[PDB]
Amino acid sequence: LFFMCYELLLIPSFLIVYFVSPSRRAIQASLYFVIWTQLGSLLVLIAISYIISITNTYEFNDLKYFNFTNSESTIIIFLIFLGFGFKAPIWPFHYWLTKTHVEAPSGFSIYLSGFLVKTALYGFYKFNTSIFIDIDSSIFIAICIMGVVDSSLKMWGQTDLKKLVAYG
Amino acid sequence: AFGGFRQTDNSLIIDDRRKIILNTRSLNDFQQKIYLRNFFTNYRPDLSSYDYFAFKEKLRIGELFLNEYRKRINNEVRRAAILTPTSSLREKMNHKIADQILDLSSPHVRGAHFQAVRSWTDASKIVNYVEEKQTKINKYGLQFPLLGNMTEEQCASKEDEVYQRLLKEMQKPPKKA
Amino acid sequence: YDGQWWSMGSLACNVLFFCTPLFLYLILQVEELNSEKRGGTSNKFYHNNAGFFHFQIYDNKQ
Amino acid sequence: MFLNPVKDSEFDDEVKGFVPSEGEVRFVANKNKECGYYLQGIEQCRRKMVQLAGDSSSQFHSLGFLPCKRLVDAHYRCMTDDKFGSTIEEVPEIGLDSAQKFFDCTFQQLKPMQSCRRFFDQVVRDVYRANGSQLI
Amino acid sequence: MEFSNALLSQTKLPGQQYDYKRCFQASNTHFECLDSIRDAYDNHHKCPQTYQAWQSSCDVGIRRYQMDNREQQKKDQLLYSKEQLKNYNAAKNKEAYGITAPKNLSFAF
Amino acid sequence: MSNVSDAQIQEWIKRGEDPKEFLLKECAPQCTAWKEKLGRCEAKLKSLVNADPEMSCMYPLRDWVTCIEACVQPAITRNLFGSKYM
Amino acid sequence: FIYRDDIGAFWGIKGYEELVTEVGTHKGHN
Amino acid sequence: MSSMLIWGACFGLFTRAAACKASMIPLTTSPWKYPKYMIVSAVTFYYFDWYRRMALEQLCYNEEKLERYQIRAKLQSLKIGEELSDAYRESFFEHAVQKNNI
Amino acid sequence: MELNSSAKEDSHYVGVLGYPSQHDPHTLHPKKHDSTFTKVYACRDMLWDHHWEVRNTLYAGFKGALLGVAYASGFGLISKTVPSIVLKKMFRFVRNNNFGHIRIMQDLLTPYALTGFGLGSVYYLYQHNVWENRSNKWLAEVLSNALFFQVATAVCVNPGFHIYGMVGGILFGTLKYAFYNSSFFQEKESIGSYTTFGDLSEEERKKQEYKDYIQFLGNYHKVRNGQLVDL
Amino acid sequence: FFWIILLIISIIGIFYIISIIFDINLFKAFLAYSTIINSISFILLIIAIIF
Amino acid sequence: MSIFSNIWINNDLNSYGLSILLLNIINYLIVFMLILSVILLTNLSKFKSLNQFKEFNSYNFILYSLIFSLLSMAGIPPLLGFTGKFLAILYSSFKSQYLLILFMTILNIFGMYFYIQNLRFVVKKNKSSILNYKNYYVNINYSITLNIILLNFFNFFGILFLSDLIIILNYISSYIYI
Amino acid sequence: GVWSNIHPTDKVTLSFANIGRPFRLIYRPEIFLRDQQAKFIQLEKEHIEKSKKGEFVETTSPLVLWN
Numbered sequence A: 001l002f003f004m005c006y007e008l009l010l011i012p013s014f015l016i017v018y019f020v021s022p023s024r025r026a027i028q029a030s031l032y033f034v035i036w037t038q039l040g041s042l043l044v045l046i047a048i049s050y051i052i053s054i055t056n057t058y059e060f061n062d063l064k065y066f067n068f069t070n071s072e073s074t075i076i077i078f079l080i081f082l083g084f085g086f087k088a089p090i091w092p093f094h095y096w097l098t099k100t101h102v103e104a105p106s107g108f109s110i111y112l113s114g115f116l117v118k119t120a121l122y123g124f125y126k127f128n129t130s131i132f133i134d135i136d137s138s139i140f141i142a143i144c145i146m147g148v149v150d151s152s153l154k155m156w157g158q159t160d161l162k163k164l165v166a167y168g
Numbered sequence B: 001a002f003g004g005f006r007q008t009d010n011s012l013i014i015d016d017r018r019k020i021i022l023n024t025r026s027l028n029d030f031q032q033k034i035y036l037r038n039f040f041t042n043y044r045p046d047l048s049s050y051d052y053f054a055f056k057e058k059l060r061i062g063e064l065f066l067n068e069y070r071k072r073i074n075n076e077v078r079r080a081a082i083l084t085p086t087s088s089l090r091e092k093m094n095h096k097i098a099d100q101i102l103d104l105s106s107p108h109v110r111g112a113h114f115q116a117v118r119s120w121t122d123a124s125k126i127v128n129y130v131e132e133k134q135t136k137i138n139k140y141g142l143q144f145p146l147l148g149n150m151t152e153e154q155c156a157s158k159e160d161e162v163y164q165r166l167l168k169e170m171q172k173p174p175k176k177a
Numbered sequence C: 001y002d003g004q005w006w007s008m009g010s011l012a013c014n015v016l017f018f019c020t021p022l023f024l025y026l027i028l029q030v031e032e033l034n035s036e037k038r039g040g041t042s043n044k045f046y047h048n049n050a051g052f053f054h055f056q057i058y059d060n061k062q
Numbered sequence D: 001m002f003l004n005p006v007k008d009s010e011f012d013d014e015v016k017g018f019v020p021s022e023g024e025v026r027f028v029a030n031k032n033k034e035c036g037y038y039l040q041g042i043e044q045c046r047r048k049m050v051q052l053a054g055d056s057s058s059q060f061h062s063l064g065f066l067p068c069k070r071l072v073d074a075h076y077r078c079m080t081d082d083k084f085g086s087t088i089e090e091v092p093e094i095g096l097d098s099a100q101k102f103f104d105c106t107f108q109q110l111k112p113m114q115s116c117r118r119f120f121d122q123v124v125r126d127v128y129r130a131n132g133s134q135l136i
Numbered sequence E: 001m002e003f004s005n006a007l008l009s010q011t012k013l014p015g016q017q018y019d020y021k022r023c024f025q026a027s028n029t030h031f032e033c034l035d036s037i038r039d040a041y042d043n044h045h046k047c048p049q050t051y052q053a054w055q056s057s058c059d060v061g062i063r064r065y066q067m068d069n070r071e072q073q074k075k076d077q078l079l080y081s082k083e084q085l086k087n088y089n090a091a092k093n094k095e096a097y098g099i100t101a102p103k104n105l106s107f108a109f
Numbered sequence F: 001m002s003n004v005s006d007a008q009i010q011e012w013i014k015r016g017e018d019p020k021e022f023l024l025k026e027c028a029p030q031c032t033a034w035k036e037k038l039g040r041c042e043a044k045l046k047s048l049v050n051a052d053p054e055m056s057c058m059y060p061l062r063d064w065v066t067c068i069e070a071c072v073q074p075a076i077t078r079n080l081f082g083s084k085y086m
Numbered sequence G: 001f002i003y004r005d006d007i008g009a010f011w012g013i014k015g016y017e018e019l020v021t022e023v024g025t026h027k028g029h030n
Numbered sequence H: 001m002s003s004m005l006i007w008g009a010c011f012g013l014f015t016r017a018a019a020c021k022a023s024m025i026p027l028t029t030s031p032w033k034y035p036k037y038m039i040v041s042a043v044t045f046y047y048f049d050w051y052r053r054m055a056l057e058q059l060c061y062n063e064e065k066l067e068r069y070q071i072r073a074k075l076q077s078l079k080i081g082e083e084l085s086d087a088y089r090e091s092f093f094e095h096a097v098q099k100n101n102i
Numbered sequence I: 001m002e003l004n005s006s007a008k009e010d011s012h013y014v015g016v017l018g019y020p021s022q023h024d025p026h027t028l029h030p031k032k033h034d035s036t037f038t039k040v041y042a043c044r045d046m047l048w049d050h051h052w053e054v055r056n057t058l059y060a061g062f063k064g065a066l067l068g069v070a071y072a073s074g075f076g077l078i079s080k081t082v083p084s085i086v087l088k089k090m091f092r093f094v095r096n097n098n099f100g101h102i103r104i105m106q107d108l109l110t111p112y113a114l115t116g117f118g119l120g121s122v123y124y125l126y127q128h129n130v131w132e133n134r135s136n137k138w139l140a141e142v143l144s145n146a147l148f149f150q151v152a153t154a155v156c157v158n159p160g161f162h163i164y165g166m167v168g169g170i171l172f173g174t175l176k177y178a179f180y181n182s183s184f185f186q187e188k189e190s191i192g193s194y195t196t197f198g199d200l201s202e203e204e205r206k207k208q209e210y211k212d213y214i215q216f217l218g219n220y221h222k223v224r225n226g227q228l229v230d231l
Numbered sequence J: 001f002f003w004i005i006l007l008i009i010s011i012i013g014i015f016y017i018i019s020i021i022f023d024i025n026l027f028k029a030f031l032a033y034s035t036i037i038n039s040i041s042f043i044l045l046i047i048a049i050i051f
Numbered sequence K: 001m002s003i004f005s006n007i008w009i010n011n012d013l014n015s016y017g018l019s020i021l022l023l024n025i026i027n028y029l030i031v032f033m034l035i036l037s038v039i040l041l042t043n044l045s046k047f048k049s050l051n052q053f054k055e056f057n058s059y060n061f062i063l064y065s066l067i068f069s070l071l072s073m074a075g076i077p078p079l080l081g082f083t084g085k086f087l088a089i090l091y092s093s094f095k096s097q098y099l100l101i102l103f104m105t106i107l108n109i110f111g112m113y114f115y116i117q118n119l120r121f122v123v124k125k126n127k128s129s130i131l132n133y134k135n136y137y138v139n140i141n142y143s144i145t146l147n148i149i150l151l152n153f154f155n156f157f158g159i160l161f162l163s164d165l166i167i168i169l170n171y172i173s174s175y176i177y178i
Numbered sequence L: 001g002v003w004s005n006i007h008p009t010d011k012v013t014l015s016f017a018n019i020g021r022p023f024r025l026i027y028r029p030e031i032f033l034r035d036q037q038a039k040f041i042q043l044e045k046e047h048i049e050k051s052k053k054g055e056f057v058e059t060t061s062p063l064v065l066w067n
């Protein structure tokens, strides 16, 4: 149910961007948003399939009595991180975010940036705290820091206020 | 029911207890559970779910308690600085207070670090210290409104028990030497 | 044309910007070497709670 | 739990904590994981017996909790590795007191299995501390 | 399907046919004798005449299916009872209306 | 948390016991051809009445022990402290 | 140019043919 | 809620309303089709409930036979030489001798 | 059908079962009284010796050359367009020379055969000398194949497609780890199979199996959570 | 024997259509390539089943 | 398959992959039927190029029916095709086929964009006239609209009722002894 | 309610979470477990009878089943 609720958010947001955005570029921005977010959705789906098929449980707490091997754990963490970072923008997967923020309704960009990128963070927190992971997080930390540095450096060259706020 | 994931390694597993030999790639779900996946993922795997939840809460409270010790000693240092003039201030600080300040450094108390890197033995020791403080408090029943919840009958019984304990302690003679 | 990105601007700065993620990762690994040899916080997914979420309500029903 | 009383204490009650050995922790964890079926069986059988013969007028009211004896003995054997006797009554004197406490928790006070597993694990830990190399 | 007893029995020769009436009559007689014997393991040698008649009348596949069904019926009879199954099914159907909430902070395992 | 929690199992080496005694039997079956060759050579040498002193049931045994140890030794060495665990 | 692997000489180095020398280096990797 | 007939009646009512809206005709057009749709939906969904429950029961029964196939299929799937090994010899003899009761 | 059957063999299992082992020496030992011709002909077991670096390298080169020739036969030559004058000249050569088709085939397939041989030999040497004793087999295969196919696409095809070469190399490495170094559709053991050692009585084995079943019961969620109705 | 043939066919078909499906400009072509993609996915599922 | 003192225990249902395949085929047929019914309700001669997806820019029922049918074919989570794709990936994980999962995901994402790109063409400058004229007025078929509405309801809420369909398909497949 | 009245778990969870597990295990798990334990039941009965008698059998002692 957690995963299904996370995945349900795509249709209303896409419909809003498609039918409510005044700008003509919103038509392409919506497709970019859909494809970029759905790639991460598929990654998270693969992770959920790994968890469910290996562990038939669904209660979110029976995972305490089941331990994933090293290979399964590393695969799960990588898939979860990449999939949820597709939604919560991370370097290099923020082209869709920039396009959507630039070409989306001014009222819907508020909701997108404010909330729709944090359900991914909540899901990542839940899954990674539920699963025991025995891998170095240096790669993920480096990815996050690289995204921070990239956005901060690119802030200067944006004369468009909406795109500057998107980089922020 | 729990299942497993097909393995690819070609290593050989020896189970001396059952006196059998298996191959990693040939393991089924139950054999994978028995041989692989058995490793521990918590400080005290011996404890049950409820017991380890209590252990986790006590460990968190103990970390906060050590941080509270550090905050209290810092506040005492501030009090000393304000009350005592700079002359003789360091002379008086070169006492229990300075030793405690050094002994409550980062390795011993997690001030602002994300994680206090503690072995399972260290976590057990911290939880035992918290439990010792809890026992000392519960002897006199100081935890009714704070750090505890009880009904009216429980409160009355605890009051009677603490009264009897205090009477016995008072009647006891002084410790020799 | 293909490859114009490297030449445009300054090649040295472009290559440094390209290699930035690796520099960050290597710096993190060195800091983790320091952490390992000392005993401080390391870059790992700690599992202090046995799946117990932060201030989650754990209850049973009759 | 894991607290030892202070023999020479100025006040009536004082306790100093101790950390069990890694071998003891490993043994207890492994045995709990292997024999967790028996503890759940004990709980369910206790509830079933109370339901069946809880009423005083019931015919089997005089045989209360006897069927749970087999479950308790099987759990004891599983935890102790079939050594130190084949029955709970054969528990060593080192753990006899903890066994009595466990029985009082489970059958007389009817306290939660969360509580009574503490006493059962205390029995197992006492046996392990007494022997050491015999269990591993 | 090479491992499927049912399909291998469904296979047949081009001109082969089964006299179901006669085979089932013989099987009913033999199984009545076996039930009268009432042993844990079906010893066909205790009923020689009926066993021979059953073998002659019925085909190998039909006999295999009948023996497997008899084994399953014996196991079910040893395990369950009519009233017990009725009560258990009623209780399970009643439970199906409710929800199965997780049991947090367990004590076992 | 890795290496910070308790270990689930202790091996023969972790308990201070020698596992090669059993590992030799464990690795015996795979080196069957050389064992059979050594047995045949021993049988022929026993049958021979006037055997040249050069003849010896040594080199086939050398091959058999080489094949056994090629499997026995690495398994034990990978489990020893001081070497990167496999 | 080609040195038989069962003679007891590794890579053609004759001698040491009464010993077990290929263990850990050629046959097996300690 | 609990009555499949009432659930089907509601489904038919909403289906008729949606059909009217999609066709852009007033929702009061062809009033006789409301009770018709309600009755048809109730009957079909009631039958589908009964059929799903029957299919579940028959599937549970068939799984018992399927278990017998799995046990015998597993033995026949054993690689050459494993049928007399210590890990399968006893089961193979059980299935080749004890069950050879024809 | 199995890929790399010899490498992924359970020597202990085949030995205990008595199944013939692919690791047998497979060598010829001519007798000292045999004829000179027999002794000379018995040297062919060198061509079977698998510890032969040069033999293996030539084997890989032959495989690569065959693959290149097949690619030229199927797709490469047909896709490539030859000048009309060149086609006329080579047809005239066929008319004026017996077996001219053989020489034309040699000329057309020389580039593909040579490049395939080079790729095969270099790939074999690369994989054997490097990555053969790495810890993470999957990672080693992925990285090695990615780098090799990146370089190969940069050189043979076009330097501008090296990223696609690297991606294809990663995919090929994953596929090779799946179905070349691992046995997913090439199982030669029954799942859950094992071997028994030591002098344990059948009674003791059955008791241990009963304990194992009791432990296995805990896997079921209903029994572990105590959420079963009273049957 | 079927597993390897199915795997090779699936891989070749996927790598052959990945670019073609984006070259069409007709409704009928769109329908046909939808059918083809679903067929490839079902072939992969069949491989998984026969595993 | 587990052995405990010669007692076999089977926690896997062999007749499940066939059920999943049947479910995928049925779901694709249902979505194809929905889209083709939407097409048949309108004039057929208009739709001859991907550009002509704009011709679907008609009243809300047709427009949104096409949009949701395309999304379902793509595999967007809430819709019907997602059920089939997710169950296929789940069965692949159960069978432990990581490479098959990888290739399935690649094909799924490529096909997803292949379906999605047509939503760009669906945008039209004005409202199209794609209905056949009968008796001087556009002919709208109530029966086909009702069928499209039932298909739309099932496409939207297939996840809710999928358990019954899965049970039925597994029941049908169990008769096969494989 | 009605659509889910067959099982306490929700329909979506039934459809997706349970992959490959027998419907006998999903519904009516007690009958599944008893069928699995069929022979163990008679072994336990024989062990109990012998224990009442003088003989004590250690081979089947672990078999103490409650479900």
Ligand SMILES: CCCCCCCCCCCCCCCCCC(=O)OC[C@H](COP(=O)([O-])OCC(O)COP(=O)([O-])OC[C@@H](COC(=O)CCCCCCCCCCCCCCCCC)OC(=O)CCCCCCCCCCCCCCCCC)OC(=O)CCCCCCCCCCCCCCCCC
Binding pocket: C009, C010, C011, C012, C013, C023
């Ligand atoms: C691995 C070991 C490391 C440790 C050892 C010690 C360090 C050794 C490092 C190497 C130093 C010698 C080689 C450098 C050659 C120049 C770079 C190059 O090849 O690029 C093409 C070079 C640059 O062309 P371009 O940038 O495309 O065109 C810009 C035009 O100038 C138009 O430009 P503009 O007017 O618009 O102004 C832009 C200008 C100014 O730009 C700015 O103001 C913006 C900021 C730019 C970056 C400034 C550097 C900041 C510090 C870098 C820290 C890096 C850390 C991460 C890497 C760690 C690796 C260990 O931008 C530049 O900086 C361009 C000049 C070249 C780059 C200089 C800075 C980076 C060099 C690399 C340093 C590496 C240090 C490693 C050690 C770190 C400490 C642990 O092209 C030319 O040849 C044209 C002439 C440019 C001036 C050359 C100055 C003389 C340099 C020495 C020549 C002799 C070298 C002998 C080599 C011997 C064999 C080994």
Ligand SMILES: CCCCCCCCCCCCCCCCCC(=O)OC[C@H](COP(=O)([O-])OCC(O)COP(=O)([O-])OC[C@@H](COC(=O)CCCCCCCCCCCCCCCCC)OC(=O)CCCCCCCCCCCCCCCCC)OC(=O)CCCCCCCCCCCCCCCCC
Binding pocket: I094, I097, I098, I099, I100, I101, I102, I105
């Ligand atoms: C059995 C079925 C086939 C029967 C024969 C054909 C009749 C039925 C036809 C219907 C079937 C489909 C035909 C489609 C034809 C396609 C187009 C075409 O080429 O024909 C048009 C071609 C041109 O027609 P045109 O324009 O009217 O005539 C113009 C000129 O008059 C034409 O004169 P030209 O001189 O210019 O043309 C000669 C033509 C025919 O060729 C010949 O002249 C005869 C070739 C005889 C084979 C010689 C090779 C050695 C054989 C050894 C056998 C014993 C080995 C024992 C092994 C023991 C080991 C322990 O040459 C070729 O086709 C070129 C290839 C021939 C060499 C084949 C080499 C195979 C082995 C290579 C292995 C790898 C080597 C690596 C490098 C090694 C370096 C040391 O028509 C013809 O010439 C007549 C048809 C001939 C078709 C030949 C098809 C190739 C198969 C050759 C035999 C394969 C043997 C494999 C086993 C042995 C392996 C060692």
Ligand SMILES: CCCCCCCCCCCCCCCCCC(=O)OC[C@H](COP(=O)([O-])OCC(O)COP(=O)([O-])OC[C@@H](COC(=O)CCCCCCCCCCCCCCCCC)OC(=O)CCCCCCCCCCCCCCCCC)OC(=O)CCCCCCCCCCCCCCCCC
Binding pocket: I114, I115, I117, I118, I119, I121, I122, I147, I151
């Ligand atoms: C790319 C690597 C893999 C290659 C695979 C293919 C191998 C072919 C067979 C072996 C060839 C032997 C060497 C002869 C030259 C071959 C090349 C050649 O002629 O090319 C034409 C030209 C040289 O011909 P030339 O100008 O007419 O005059 C040459 C003299 O005749 C030269 O003659 P010389 O009299 O001055 O003497 C040269 C001496 C020089 O000796 C050496 O120095 C060699 C040893 C050092 C090199 C070791 C390899 C590299 C190791 C480092 C790897 C780093 C990778 C890091 C990756 C990081 C991750 C991204 O070598 C010999 O003559 C010894 C020959 C002994 C016999 C060898 C037996 C081979 C048997 C197999 C034959 C295969 C036949 C089929 C081949 C065709 C089909 C594939 O060379 C090139 O164009 C090469 C370009 C290389 C790239 C650009 C370099 C500058 C910019 C730096 C780029 C950095 C990229 C680094 C990697 C990526 C990082 C992101």
Ligand SMILES: CCCCCCCCCCCCCCCCCC(=O)OC[C@H](COP(=O)([O-])OCC(O)COP(=O)([O-])OC[C@@H](COC(=O)CCCCCCCCCCCCCCCCC)OC(=O)CCCCCCCCCCCCCCCCC)OC(=O)CCCCCCCCCCCCCCCCC
Binding pocket: A001, A004, A005, A008, A011, H011, H014, H015, H017, H018, H019, H021, H022, K060, K061, K064, K065, K078, K148, K149, K150, K152, K153, K156, K157, K159, K160, L012
């Ligand atoms: C006259 C009809 C009046 C209906 C009244 C309401 C009664 C129920 C509906 C019965 C309708 C039967 C006949 C079919 C007509 C619809 C099809 C059609 O073509 O009609 C054309 C007909 C005329 O054509 P048109 O209006 O010109 O063309 C417009 C197009 O249809 C475009 O229209 P649209 O864009 O507005 O369409 C809706 C749009 C988007 O629709 C939505 O997003 C629907 C939002 C519903 C609100 C609740 C969502 C809560 C989510 C929480 C998370 C749950 C996670 C669970 C884990 C698994 C994942 C779900 O598409 C979807 O639905 C796709 C996304 C589906 C998401 C799946 C959500 C499942 C939630 C299950 C219910 C939860 C209840 C919990 C509380 C109870 C606990 C005991 O259209 C209409 O008149 C409007 C239809 C709009 C949809 C109506 C239903 C929305 C309200 C639902 C309330 C009840 C909950 C749902 C369960 C229902 C029982 C299974």
Ligand SMILES: CCCCCCCCCCCCCCCCCC(=O)OC[C@H](COP(=O)([O-])OCC(O)COP(=O)([O-])OC[C@@H](COC(=O)CCCCCCCCCCCCCCCCC)OC(=O)CCCCCCCCCCCCCCCCC)OC(=O)CCCCCCCCCCCCCCCCC
Binding pocket: H012, H015, H016, H033, H036, H037, H040, H041, H044, H048, K030, K033, K143, K146, K150, K151, K154, K157, K158, K159, K161, K162, K164, K165
């Ligand atoms: C989770 C994923 C789920 C995916 C679902 C996929 C399918 C969804 C869409 C299609 C579903 C079927 C819809 C009904 C048929 C279409 C025709 C119709 O009834 O409407 C026209 C008709 C319109 O009447 P009208 O507007 O007054 O006048 C029309 C013309 O003027 C005058 O009309 P007319 O004179 O030309 O014709 C009148 C005649 C026209 O009716 C027809 O000719 C029906 C045409 C369809 C025949 C096939 C139906 C098969 C049903 C079995 C389930 C499979 C469904 C497969 C569907 C897709 C296949 C491509 O009307 C009827 O009698 C309708 C009766 C419909 C029920 C038929 C039941 C047959 C059961 C046979 C199998 C029994 C099991 C055997 C077990 C064996 C064991 C050994 O509709 C109605 O009268 C009622 C409309 C509103 C309520 C509809 C209720 C539909 C309930 C569907 C339940 C589906 C199964 C349960 C759910 C499963 C998933 C959990």
Ligand SMILES: CCCCCCCCCCCCCCCCCC(=O)OC[C@H](COP(=O)([O-])OCC[N+](C)(C)C)OC(=O)CCCCCCCCCCCCCCCCC
Binding pocket: H025, H026, H027, H028, H034
């Ligand atoms: C013993 C049995 C005795 C049975 C006796 C018979 C009972 C008959 C009951 C008939 C009730 C009719 C109610 C009509 C309400 C109209 C409301 C309205 O004006 O809305 C207009 C609205 C608006 O329609 P509109 O499209 O014209 O809109 C007009 C508004 N402007 C101008 C802006 C366009 O539409 C409707 O709601 C009407 C259509 C839907 C009608 C639904 C009727 C359902 C009837 C269910 C009966 C169930 C019986 C169960 C019996 C069980 C027995 C066991």
Ligand SMILES: CCCCCCCCCCCCCCCCCC(=O)OC[C@H](COP(=O)([O-])OCC[N+](C)(C)C)OC(=O)CCCCCCCCCCCCCCCCC
Binding pocket: I134, I135, I136, I137, I139, I140, I142, I143, I144, I146, I147, I170
């Ligand atoms: C579907 C999944 C997709 C997976 C994507 C896979 C990514 C592929 C990336 C290919 C990169 C190009 C080929 C690299 C080949 C070298 C790899 C290597 O040395 O590692 C082997 C060794 C062998 O490792 P190992 O096998 O001994 O131990 C593995 C250890 N554990 C188990 C913890 C994983 O691995 C490493 O030490 C690195 C592993 C991580 C990969 C790092 C790649 C670095 C690439 C840049 C190198 C720069 C060199 C200096 C020049 C810088 C610029 C001036």
